[PDB]
Amino acid sequence: HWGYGKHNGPEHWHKDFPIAKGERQSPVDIDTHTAKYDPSLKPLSVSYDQATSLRILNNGHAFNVEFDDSQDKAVLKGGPLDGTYRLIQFHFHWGSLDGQGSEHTVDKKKYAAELHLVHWNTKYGDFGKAVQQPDGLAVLGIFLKVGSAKPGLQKVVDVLDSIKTKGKSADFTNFDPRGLLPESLDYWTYPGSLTTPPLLECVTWIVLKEPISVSSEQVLKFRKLNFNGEGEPEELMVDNWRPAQPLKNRQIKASFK
Ligand SMILES: CCn1cc(-c2cc(C(=O)O)n(C)n2)c2ccccc21
Ligand SMILES: [Zn+2]
Structure with a gap:
C-alpha cells in the first residue's frame, strides 16, 4: 500500500494509479514570471462564518479536520469557480526540516508546510460523485513559513497528542478555520488533481500568494505524529508531500498584477 517512503512513495504510485502520469497532475511549480494575470478573474468568496467542525483524524498519511458538509455552512465561491463548493475537510503536508514540506513551489522555493482546504461542488450531490468530475473539487492551498506563531493554529497543535497514531480520532x-487564512486573498489558479492516491483529476487549485507564519514549536509538534498504528514500530509522520509534477498543457493564472 502506498505511502511516502523509499519503497512506496511518489515514484511508485503510478503502478497502482496510472493517472499519476496524466495530463493534469498536482502539485506543480508556480513560475511567477510566466503566470498570466487574468483581469476577468473575480475575488474569492470565502464564507466560513457558519462552519461546523466535527472531528480530527490521523489517517496514516496526514491528519484531517472534518466538517459537516450536509448543508451550505462553509462554502467557497467566486474566483475561477462557477457555483458553490462546500468545505469537507482540511489537512496539511509538511517536512522533516524547515526548508521542505510544501507540495506546490514558487519559483522552485519550498515552504515548510502547506495547508489544503478541500471543497466539493454541490451540483454533484456528494464528495464521492464530485471526485469523478473535472470540476468536482476546489482546493484552497496556503503556504506555511516558520517565524511567528499562528494563534489560530494552536488548537490543532494541542490535540495532536491524542491522535498520535494511524486510525485515532x-x-x-x-x-x-478563518484563523488559518492570511490577510490577502490574492491567488494563482490552475486545473489539477488530488495529490495523494487515487490522484483523480478533479481539482480546481487556488493557491494563495501570501503565506501564513507558524512557529518552530508548532511545526515541531506536527513532526511528532506517527504514520504507524499504535503498537507498531514508530515512524515519524514527516515529508508527506508529493513533489512538483510536469505542467504539460496548462497555464497558471494570477488574480493580481
Ligand atoms: C484513500 C482513498 N482516497 C483518498 C482521497 C483523497 C485524496 C485527497 C487529496 O489529495 O487531497 N483528497 C482530498 N481526498 C479520496 C477521494 C475519494 C475516494 C477515495 C480517496
Ligand atoms: Zn493535500
Whole structure:
C-alpha cells in the first residue's frame, strides 16, 4: 500500500494509479514570471462564518479536520469557480526540516508546510460523485513559513497528542478555520488533481500568494505524529508531500498584477 517512503512513495504510485502520469497532475511549480494575470478573474468568496467542525483524524498519511458538509455552512465561491463548493475537510503536508514540506513551489522555493482546504461542488450531490468530475473539487492551498506563531493554529497543535497514531480520532468541534487564512486573498489558479492516491483529476487549485507564519514549536509538534498504528514500530509522520509534477498543457493564472 502506498505511502511516502523509499519503497512506496511518489515514484511508485503510478503502478497502482496510472493517472499519476496524466495530463493534469498536482502539485506543480508556480513560475511567477510566466503566470498570466487574468483581469476577468473575480475575488474569492470565502464564507466560513457558519462552519461546523466535527472531528480530527490521523489517517496514516496526514491528519484531517472534518466538517459537516450536509448543508451550505462553509462554502467557497467566486474566483475561477462557477457555483458553490462546500468545505469537507482540511489537512496539511509538511517536512522533516524547515526548508521542505510544501507540495506546490514558487519559483522552485519550498515552504515548510502547506495547508489544503478541500471543497466539493454541490451540483454533484456528494464528495464521492464530485471526485469523478473535472470540476468536482476546489482546493484552497496556503503556504506555511516558520517565524511567528499562528494563534489560530494552536488548537490543532494541542490535540495532536491524542491522535498520535494511524486510525485515532478525536472530537474537534467549534474550530474556526478563518484563523488559518492570511490577510490577502490574492491567488494563482490552475486545473489539477488530488495529490495523494487515487490522484483523480478533479481539482480546481487556488493557491494563495501570501503565506501564513507558524512557529518552530508548532511545526515541531506536527513532526511528532506517527504514520504507524499504535503498537507498531514508530515512524515519524514527516515529508508527506508529493513533489512538483510536469505542467504539460496548462497555464497558471494570477488574480493580481
Ligand atoms: C484513500 C482513498 N482516497 C483518498 C482521497 C483523497 C485524496 C485527497 C487529496 O489529495 O487531497 N483528497 C482530498 N481526498 C479520496 C477521494 C475519494 C475516494 C477515495 C480517496
Ligand atoms: Zn493535500
